[PDB]
Write a protein that binds this DNA or RNA. Sequence first.
DNA 1: TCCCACGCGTGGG
DNA 2: TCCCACGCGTGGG
Lengths: 87, 85
Amino acid sequence: MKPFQCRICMRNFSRSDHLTTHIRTHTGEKPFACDICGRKFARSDERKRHRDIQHILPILEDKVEELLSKNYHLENEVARLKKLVGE
Amino acid sequence: MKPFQCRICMRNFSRSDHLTTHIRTHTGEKPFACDICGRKFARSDERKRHRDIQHILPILEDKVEELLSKNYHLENEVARLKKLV
DNA sequence: TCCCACGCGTGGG
DNA sequence: TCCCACGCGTGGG
Ligand SMILES: [Zn+2]
Ligand SMILES: [Zn+2]
Ligand SMILES: [Zn+2]
Ligand SMILES: [Zn+2]
């Protein structure tokens, strides 16, 4: 059953929310803006895939590298300090 | 602009690689398996979106949490030893 | 409800 | 046919 019809192209859809997003293919409406870069998308899931992989993934990869490095510097300092005070 | 043709459904395509992956929709071929859960995909980019979000992001979050914890304990052995000093 | 995932067309490198 | 990103159909929960 496809009870929801687009009045522009007359295509029917099984879901009303899918009819709503489909209509944006005609209107060009992009309600969802990425908070990091500002790129606009027609649907929230399109914004999510974009942000997850284009931003979150590399930010977390960079963070891991950064912490490994900070932790290495701190360990070096802790080792030095330990000798200055004994241990 | 669509010089390639699928001989199963007669659809025309702009590119040879796109014709190739399209044919997989008819044959059911899924060459790409996710190394983490084993799920199969027709294309590498399908496998990538799945793996990146379903497995990798959670993994990275855990890693960052773990490293942040080690960091916090080290920034503590330091403020401390410098007190002994 | 309507986010989320996935399939798959299709451009770029 | 390689890798990838994004649009957009559409079911699951
Ligand atoms: Zn329409
Ligand atoms: Zn963005
Ligand atoms: Zn075909
Ligand atoms: Zn997987």
